[PDB]
Amino acid sequence: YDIYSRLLRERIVCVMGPIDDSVASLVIAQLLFLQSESNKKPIHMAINSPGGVVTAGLAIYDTMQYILNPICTWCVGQAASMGSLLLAAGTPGMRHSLPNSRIMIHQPIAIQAEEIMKLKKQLYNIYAKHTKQSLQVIESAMERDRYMSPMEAQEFGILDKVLVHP
Amino acid sequence: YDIYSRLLRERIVCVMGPIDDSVASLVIAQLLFLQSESNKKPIHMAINSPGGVVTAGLAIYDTMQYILNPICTWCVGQAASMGSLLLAAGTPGMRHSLPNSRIMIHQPIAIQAEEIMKLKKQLYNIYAKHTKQSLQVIESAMERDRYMSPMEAQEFGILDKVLVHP
Amino acid sequence: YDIYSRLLRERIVCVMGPIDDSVASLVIAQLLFLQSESNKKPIHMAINSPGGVVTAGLAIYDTMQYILNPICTWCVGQAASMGSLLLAAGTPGMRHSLPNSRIMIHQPIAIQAEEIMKLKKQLYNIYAKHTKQSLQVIESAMERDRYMSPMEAQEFGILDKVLVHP
Amino acid sequence: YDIYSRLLRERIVCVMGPIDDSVASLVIAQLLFLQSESNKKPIHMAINSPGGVVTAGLAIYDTMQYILNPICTWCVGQAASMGSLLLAAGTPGMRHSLPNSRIMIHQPDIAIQAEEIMKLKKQLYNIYAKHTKQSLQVIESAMERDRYMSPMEAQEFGILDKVLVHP
Amino acid sequence: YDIYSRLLRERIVCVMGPIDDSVASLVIAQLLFLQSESNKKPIHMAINSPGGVVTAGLAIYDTMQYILNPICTWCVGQAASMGSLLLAAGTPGMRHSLPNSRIMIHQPDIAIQAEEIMKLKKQLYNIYAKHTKQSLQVIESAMERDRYMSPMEAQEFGILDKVLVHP
Amino acid sequence: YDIYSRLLRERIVCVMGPIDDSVASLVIAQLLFLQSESNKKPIHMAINSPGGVVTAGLAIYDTMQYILNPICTWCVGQAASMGSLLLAAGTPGMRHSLPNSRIMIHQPIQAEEIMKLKKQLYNIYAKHTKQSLQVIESAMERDRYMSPMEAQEFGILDKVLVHP
Amino acid sequence: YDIYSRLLRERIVCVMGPIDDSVASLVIAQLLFLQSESNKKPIHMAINSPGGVVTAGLAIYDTMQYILNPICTWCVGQAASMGSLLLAAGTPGMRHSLPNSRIMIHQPIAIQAEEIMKLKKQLYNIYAKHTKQSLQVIESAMERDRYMSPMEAQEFGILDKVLVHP
Amino acid sequence: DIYSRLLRERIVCVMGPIDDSVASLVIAQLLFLQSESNKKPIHMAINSPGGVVTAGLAIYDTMQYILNPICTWCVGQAASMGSLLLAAGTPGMRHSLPNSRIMIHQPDIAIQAEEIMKLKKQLYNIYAKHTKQSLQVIESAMERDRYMSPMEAQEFGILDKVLVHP
Amino acid sequence: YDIYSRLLRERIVCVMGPIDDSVASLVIAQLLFLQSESNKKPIHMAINSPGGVVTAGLAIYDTMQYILNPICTWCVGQAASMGSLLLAAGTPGMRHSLPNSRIMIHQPSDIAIQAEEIMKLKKQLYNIYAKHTKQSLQVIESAMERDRYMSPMEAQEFGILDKVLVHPP
Amino acid sequence: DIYSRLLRERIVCVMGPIDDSVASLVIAQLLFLQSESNKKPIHMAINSPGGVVTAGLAIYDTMQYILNPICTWCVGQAASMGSLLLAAGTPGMRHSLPNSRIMIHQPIAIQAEEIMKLKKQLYNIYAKHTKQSLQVIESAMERDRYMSPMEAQEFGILDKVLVHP
Numbered sequence A, B, C, G: 001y002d003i004y005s006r007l008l009r010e011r012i013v014c015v016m017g018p019i020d021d022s023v024a025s026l027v028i029a030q031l032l033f034l035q036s037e038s039n040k041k042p043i044h045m046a047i048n049s050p051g052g053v054v055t056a057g058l059a060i061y062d063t064m065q066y067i068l069n070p071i072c073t074w075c076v077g078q079a080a081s082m083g084s085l086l087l088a089a090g091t092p093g094m095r096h097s098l099p100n101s102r103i104m105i106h107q108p109i110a111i112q113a114e115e116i117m118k119l120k121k122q123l124y125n126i127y128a129k130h131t132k133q134s135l136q137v138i139e140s141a142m143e144r145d146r147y148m149s150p151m152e153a154q155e156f157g158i159l160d161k162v163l164v165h166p
Numbered sequence D, E: 001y002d003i004y005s006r007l008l009r010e011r012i013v014c015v016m017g018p019i020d021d022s023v024a025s026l027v028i029a030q031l032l033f034l035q036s037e038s039n040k041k042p043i044h045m046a047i048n049s050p051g052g053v054v055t056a057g058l059a060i061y062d063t064m065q066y067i068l069n070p071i072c073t074w075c076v077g078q079a080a081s082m083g084s085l086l087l088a089a090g091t092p093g094m095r096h097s098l099p100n101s102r103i104m105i106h107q108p109d110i111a112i113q114a115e116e117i118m119k120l121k122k123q124l125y126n127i128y129a130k131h132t133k134q135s136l137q138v139i140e141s142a143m144e145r146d147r148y149m150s151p152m153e154a155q156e157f158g159i160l161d162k163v164l165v166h167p
Numbered sequence F: 001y002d003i004y005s006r007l008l009r010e011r012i013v014c015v016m017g018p019i020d021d022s023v024a025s026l027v028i029a030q031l032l033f034l035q036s037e038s039n040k041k042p043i044h045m046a047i048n049s050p051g052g053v054v055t056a057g058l059a060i061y062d063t064m065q066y067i068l069n070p071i072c073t074w075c076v077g078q079a080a081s082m083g084s085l086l087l088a089a090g091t092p093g094m095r096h097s098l099p100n101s102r103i104m105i106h107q108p109i110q111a112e113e114i115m116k117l118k119k120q121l122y123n124i125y126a127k128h129t130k131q132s133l134q135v136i137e138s139a140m141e142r143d144r145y146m147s148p149m150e151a152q153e154f155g156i157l158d159k160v161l162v163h164p
Numbered sequence H: 001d002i003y004s005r006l007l008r009e010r011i012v013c014v015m016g017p018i019d020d021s022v023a024s025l026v027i028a029q030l031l032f033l034q035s036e037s038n039k040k041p042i043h044m045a046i047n048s049p050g051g052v053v054t055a056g057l058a059i060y061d062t063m064q065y066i067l068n069p070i071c072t073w074c075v076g077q078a079a080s081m082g083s084l085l086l087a088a089g090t091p092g093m094r095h096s097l098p099n100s101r102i103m104i105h106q107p108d109i110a111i112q113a114e115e116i117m118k119l120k121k122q123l124y125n126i127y128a129k130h131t132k133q134s135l136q137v138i139e140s141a142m143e144r145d146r147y148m149s150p151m152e153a154q155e156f157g158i159l160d161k162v163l164v165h166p
Numbered sequence I: 001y002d003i004y005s006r007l008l009r010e011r012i013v014c015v016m017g018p019i020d021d022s023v024a025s026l027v028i029a030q031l032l033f034l035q036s037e038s039n040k041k042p043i044h045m046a047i048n049s050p051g052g053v054v055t056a057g058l059a060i061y062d063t064m065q066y067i068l069n070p071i072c073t074w075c076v077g078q079a080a081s082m083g084s085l086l087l088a089a090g091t092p093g094m095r096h097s098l099p100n101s102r103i104m105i106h107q108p109s110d111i112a113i114q115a116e117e118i119m120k121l122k123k124q125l126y127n128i129y130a131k132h133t134k135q136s137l138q139v140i141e142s143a144m145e146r147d148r149y150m151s152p153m154e155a156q157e158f159g160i161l162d163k164v165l166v167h168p169p
Numbered sequence J: 001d002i003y004s005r006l007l008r009e010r011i012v013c014v015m016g017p018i019d020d021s022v023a024s025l026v027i028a029q030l031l032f033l034q035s036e037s038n039k040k041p042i043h044m045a046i047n048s049p050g051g052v053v054t055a056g057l058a059i060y061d062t063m064q065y066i067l068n069p070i071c072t073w074c075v076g077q078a079a080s081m082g083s084l085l086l087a088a089g090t091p092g093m094r095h096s097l098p099n100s101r102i103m104i105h106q107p108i109a110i111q112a113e114e115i116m117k118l119k120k121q122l123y124n125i126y127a128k129h130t131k132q133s134l135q136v137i138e139s140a141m142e143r144d145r146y147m148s149p150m151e152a153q154e155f156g157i158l159d160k161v162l163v164h165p
């Protein structure tokens, strides 16, 4: 009996490792499943990812917003690139992080020059929406190759609570 | 059934081999499971690791502090780099080691220079917290490429009991 | 069921092939398992190994000494490097070998120079402890790139009985 | 069920392909298993091997002699190097071969010194001479020739007892 | 159930793809099984093989001759080198072939000496002549030609008995 | 000596194949070389490239503009991506092409920097073809090749020659 | 003649492609050569590099400063990472750049955490010395994953003149 | 050829890792220059992270054997056996450029445990001889995984002069 | 020209690196070269080898003994396996070693041989060692059994080399 | 090049495995030395474990073709086709160093008959130059073993075993 099954029975979705179309398919499938069991019971999303494909990450993001369930996000280990975007996409008041985690919002098929900027500005708006920061701040922050502490990411607007014990 | 399914039925979590994001996910999943069965019954963590990814180790570490269960750590074979951190992070009075084990605290997507130091100082504080040593002592020891014996590591504050037989 | 799953029901643990951190984890779990069913019924350890990782072998060794069960060791095929150490680590009077086996005690993550030298003396003492020989004999014997016959290794203190038929 | 479990349910042990420590562990486990089911019912060992690791073969050899069961050896396809040694190690009167099988006794894990390889060679010399009832000098001179023997040829030599076309 | 499991319930053994010691072990194991179910009920051998190891092919051949069951051979797609030898080794009157199949008897373990390759070649010469009822002069001269035969050609030669478009 | 040296002795620089930092080093070295022998005699640049590294091409481009020699560009086979940029960067009135060639200006680091390079290419094309920025941007958006006469009617090259 | 045997006759040293220990030896040898021909005639260093090994760059830098010749640096194509350091290390008034070149000072054998910061602070001081900026400005500037235009680098102090034509 | 002219000025380049292939070349050039003049000094430019010990000791023994004075120059870095060759220069003629990195901590065929300590103890004596420090000081220093600045190595006794300009 | 073409003008043959049929061919060619030019001037052999193919080493050994020149051997860095055999095969009184070298005579465990033909080769190595070190066969057999290196002074007292030099007097 | 000076002394090196690539060079050097003088002898140094049969027979026939006397020298080892070239020297001029190893056992894709045709061709060539019977050669070549230089001299493969000149 897979341990990841008894995790699903507790409404926990693990987003660990890089994010590609294969990972997104599972996460989205698990999210739509838990919604059918209850569109009211909250869902916990554990994040330990260095990023991945943007479209695959945006696929999870729109799915997190589409469903009606509240989503508790937990940053474990690290949440970088698209991983921090999913972290900030949690239900307001339910975005958590463990004390020694690291948060990074800087960005490290084949597309055109105008297309990467379309996605980049598309990322600017999503961050500003959930962190309630200005577009100019997000641009300057994502330009810095740096990690943030859980307390730093709380001051930036990415997460709400840093917990040592429940 | 499978021997690894029986260790879990006996509240034993194996942290053996190198540590990456994949290993940490299992350990954290196994840790959260045993807590649900009982937030009072202790958990046994067997460690035979040469280290691994820092964020993955801090992920397990933060989870060890998060849960309420007492955690008995056992160094078998060796516990080096992030492995020694998990060993010293056990519940005080329950950090064990077998007689012929070796303990090493020296540290061997990329990051910037200012970021790895944010992690070393993050490791300095965690060691000093559980070994009850000064930051200068932890820093000075970690500068030496060396292993410690169970009795050597016991005086330093890494483990509490050295057992040949119970 | 599986032939190796039926061996476990007969208290037989197979240490064949090279020894690494993966082998030690499996063997230790089986040893801890058989002890739980009965701390009095003996355990049989079949050895056909050319050696392996030192720390992984010492992990099995400390577990062999830790538990209360008597351990019958059987040298089948060959027991070289760390393999002979586990063979000699059996309960006195229960160290066997088949007639055409070869026994070798000579030794063929990165460590420093002092630490591998710390490990050989760690091997010297364990051999000298179980063969009742002097350290000078063990040091001089391990200097010879050579194999011993089962009766020769019995003369040396590595095993007690050489059996052709039961 | 699995055919190899049906073979095991009929006391048949398959020694096919090269021999390494991985093969020997299974064969020894299957032999110790069948002895527990019955130390009196014979065991059938089918051999189609070109040889393999010497220490792994001697593990099977010592195990074949250790147990109390009679062991019927059947050479199908070929038995070379350690395979013929396991073939000749059967219970006298129970060493078989099929008509088109190929028998070879000439020899072609970790490294070894020179003295150890000659130790292993003389260890092979003694085992053959014991079961073929030939002299050691004959075995040494025969093993010097890079050659195969026919099933009938090996019967005159003492490696196998019966060459069967039909039962 | 696996289609290869249901095939066995109808006494069909599939010899398809190249022939090695691994393939021979399966075929021999399945053949011994069906004999236990019935030493009288026939066995069906479907062949779509380009050849393979000689000793592995001889292993199946000797096993086909050893057992008592009648064996129906079917050439499907192609049967070349050792594959055609097993095709001709069927029970007389039970060797079939489909219309668009192709049969080849021309030839393309450890490293073998020169005298050993001829001993295997002469071993193949005799097996063909026994089952095709042809002379050695015909077999050797035919095997010298790098060529395929039609099912009707191979029937005139003695390799198979029936060429069927429909049953 | 080497046939490519007797080409150099006649003021011919070959830019054929993809463009990397290695190609630019040779072209820049050969361009600086021919200028010393004579800052007035023109230089002939044969181009058969599908593109390459942007920075290496701009290195060649900036050097073509830097030197005082007139630059005759020749599109033979094809000139795509950065190759067409070097083709249009020739001295006005000296940009040639053979009849069966094909010219491509569509283009196959951080997002803000990839965009900085694209807009940087827009200006270089518009400068040498004398077309509007919207025209260059809209043209470079189409994944397609142009005929030698089309590239003349666009400002990329001046003459299409069958025989000298 | 060979063009590379002719660049040297004009006191031109090419620093193009990535920088490793092999490139530095060639560059250093050619620099030491040109000084012997004349310790007064200037040397021209063309730079088209995306960076490389830090120690290899410092080898060229110390050699550029050691020799007595004036050094004219030319940024053609790009000068990133260690390339921008060599560009700014030219003789004041002799650091050039072509109009479409791009300059990057952000930085994209194994070392320890304390040692990578020593190299970073070592890069901070070399940049600050030649650009006449504060250490605080350099640290924040090198933190931005971005390239600079030739005019930007002229204001920041990396180069002195931007030439379209001589 | 620049490498033919380097030799014409009595300069021997030891750059990159050190193997038997490098040592043979270096030894040949050293033996060559001694015949040209047993009095004219030889200049050794070193940019190495270390390598095989026996090859380094081969160069060391050859450097000491000949009668010529030997000027050593640390350029870029001199670590492991490279620093040993650096300190093996003629006293008063061991230089280093300001941004170099000197390391004395240690990271052809397999060797036994006793025969790595004999090499390690062999390195201790050579360092103490050429640095004029005690063996106890050298041993404790070589245990620290860290680099020294040229001025630090000047204070430690590895080199004599740190020059920015001559 | 090449620096290796300048050692040759000074009668120096480099046996540096592992030994295969390719290395032996050069050494054999270089050795016959220096003897034909002069059968009286000595030849200097610098050795920095961990061993190699046995037959290739015996090719150098038989060639070293065949020619008339005295041969000065130099152990630099290390001389292990077949390297020490060529080192000990130098003309008596002309076998050198630098102070930090490491000499090994234990053999580590171009075609594949049979079991009987490896003992024919080991005994072939035993006799050559005992001949040049003037130790007993029982000592050489027992010595080559120890997986160990010798110091130049250790290897001198054993009979492998004659002089340990820091500087030439 | 040292190998160019070797040719100036009429020495041809047959070292390493034998393939069509090695044979072409050796034959060219042999054809070269005959043009220089069909009377001055040629020295063939052999340190080979064998190789392709057709390449060896190509070298062998050329050794027999030319009129020059050919001195063969076994250094290190001469196995498979290497021993054939060793015995193919002019009688009385086939030498060997003391520690050399001689092996006569033979350890594109060809058919069984053509492979058996090649062995019998090797049987006859050995018997011709060693002056032995086919029965002796077949039985000797059947043993996977090496011979000493004195052993091979008693067999007829070489003439002199030299320690010093």
Ligand SMILES: O=C(NCc1ccc2c(c1)OCO2)c1nnc(Cc2ccc(F)cc2Cl)o1
Binding pocket: A028, A029, A032, A033, A034, A036, A063, A066
């Ligand atoms: O019926 C639907 N859900 C109920 C459901 C029930 C049980 C599940 C399940 C889903 O998943 C496994 O167990 C549904 N149908 N269409 C959508 C919209 C949609 C939204 C996001 C996305 F990525 C893809 C889609 Cl299609 O929802």
Ligand SMILES: O=C(NCc1ccc2c(c1)OCO2)c1nnc(Cc2ccc(F)cc2Cl)o1
Binding pocket: A006, A007, A010, A012, A044, A046, A074, A076, A098, B028, B029, B032, B033, B036, B063, B066
């Ligand atoms: O304990 C929790 N649920 C009970 C439970 C959890 C997992 C289980 C289980 C029962 O039975 C088998 O598996 C829980 N509450 N919030 C979270 C999110 C989270 C994820 C990772 C992490 F490091 C820290 C946190 Cl807080 O988990």
Ligand SMILES: O=C(NCc1ccc2c(c1)OCO2)c1nnc(Cc2ccc(F)cc2Cl)o1
Binding pocket: B003, B006, B007, B010, B012, B044, B045, B046, B074, B076, C028, C029, C030, C032, C033, C036, C063
């Ligand atoms: O109750 C214990 N065992 C009983 C047991 C029962 C069933 C098992 C089993 C073990 O293993 C599979 O099935 C126990 N006591 N101490 C520990 C910690 C420990 C000690 C030594 C060591 F090498 C590793 C570890 Cl984790 O565990």
Ligand SMILES: O=C(NCc1ccc2c(c1)OCO2)c1nnc(Cc2ccc(F)cc2Cl)o1
Binding pocket: C003, C006, C007, C010, C012, C044, C046, C047, C074, C076, D028, D029, D030, D032, D033, D035, D036, D063, D066
């Ligand atoms: O316990 C034995 N039989 C009972 C048995 C029952 C079920 C089995 C089995 C064995 O094996 C599979 O399932 C036994 N028989 N002989 C020995 C000595 C021995 C010899 C060689 C070796 F490698 C290991 C050993 Cl223990 O033990």
Ligand SMILES: O=C(NCc1ccc2c(c1)OCO2)c1nnc(Cc2ccc(F)cc2Cl)o1
Binding pocket: D003, D006, D007, D010, D012, D044, D046, D074, D076, E028, E029, E032, E033, E034, E035, E036, E063, E066
């Ligand atoms: O008829 C037989 N019934 C026993 C049997 C029953 C069920 C089986 C089986 C075997 O195998 C799986 O299912 C039989 N078995 N073996 C032989 C002789 C033989 C022939 C060829 C060979 F390579 C090896 C041998 Cl031992 O006869």
Ligand SMILES: O=C(NCc1ccc2c(c1)OCO2)c1nnc(Cc2ccc(F)cc2Cl)o1
Binding pocket: F028, F029, F030, F031, F032, F033, F034, F036, F063, F066, G003, G006, G007, G010, G012, G044, G046, G074, G076
């Ligand atoms: O010295 C120059 N010419 C002499 C010369 C002579 C022979 C050559 C050669 C050059 O090249 C091979 O053969 C020179 N002319 N302009 C510059 C500035 C410059 C501009 C761009 C650039 F990428 C590099 C530089 Cl240095 O320098």
Ligand SMILES: O=C(NCc1ccc2c(c1)OCO2)c1nnc(Cc2ccc(F)cc2Cl)o1
Binding pocket: G028, G029, G030, G032, G033, G036, G063, G066, H002, H005, H006, H009, H011, H043, H044, H045, H073, H075
């Ligand atoms: O001979 C020297 N100069 C003249 C010279 C002439 C021709 C050259 C040459 C050098 O090099 C190619 O052709 C010299 N001797 N010592 C130094 C100090 C030094 C400084 C930095 C460095 F990395 C290495 C060293 Cl050695 O310079």
Ligand SMILES: O=C(NCc1ccc2c(c1)OCO2)c1nnc(Cc2ccc(F)cc2Cl)o1
Binding pocket: H027, H028, H031, H032, H035, H062, H065, I006, I007, I010, I012, I044, I045, I046, I074, I076
């Ligand atoms: O005969 C010699 N003439 C000098 C010389 C040497 C090499 C040359 C050269 C001139 O010109 C180009 O190359 C000679 N010098 N040293 C030795 C012995 C020796 C061998 C190896 C070693 F590491 C140390 C030493 Cl001392 O002999």
Ligand SMILES: O=C(NCc1ccc2c(c1)OCO2)c1nnc(Cc2ccc(F)cc2Cl)o1
Binding pocket: I028, I029, I030, I031, I032, I033, I034, I036, I063, I066, J002, J005, J006, J009, J011, J043, J044, J045, J073, J075
């Ligand atoms: O012709 C000989 N010398 C002349 C000569 C001249 C210049 C050389 C050379 C040789 O070598 C390159 O430069 C010669 N002297 N002895 C032999 C017998 C021999 C012994 C061993 C061996 F491996 C090969 C042979 Cl041929 O031949």
Ligand SMILES: O=C(NCc1ccc2c(c1)OCO2)c1nnc(Cc2ccc(F)cc2Cl)o1
Binding pocket: J027, J028, J029, J031, J032, J033, J034, J035, J062, J065
């Ligand atoms: O001396 C001959 N030509 C002149 C010559 C001169 C120098 C050479 C050479 C050839 O070759 C390089 O150096 C010669 N003698 N016989 C033949 C015919 C022949 C014989 C055997 C063979 F395999 C191939 C051929 Cl073509 O030609």
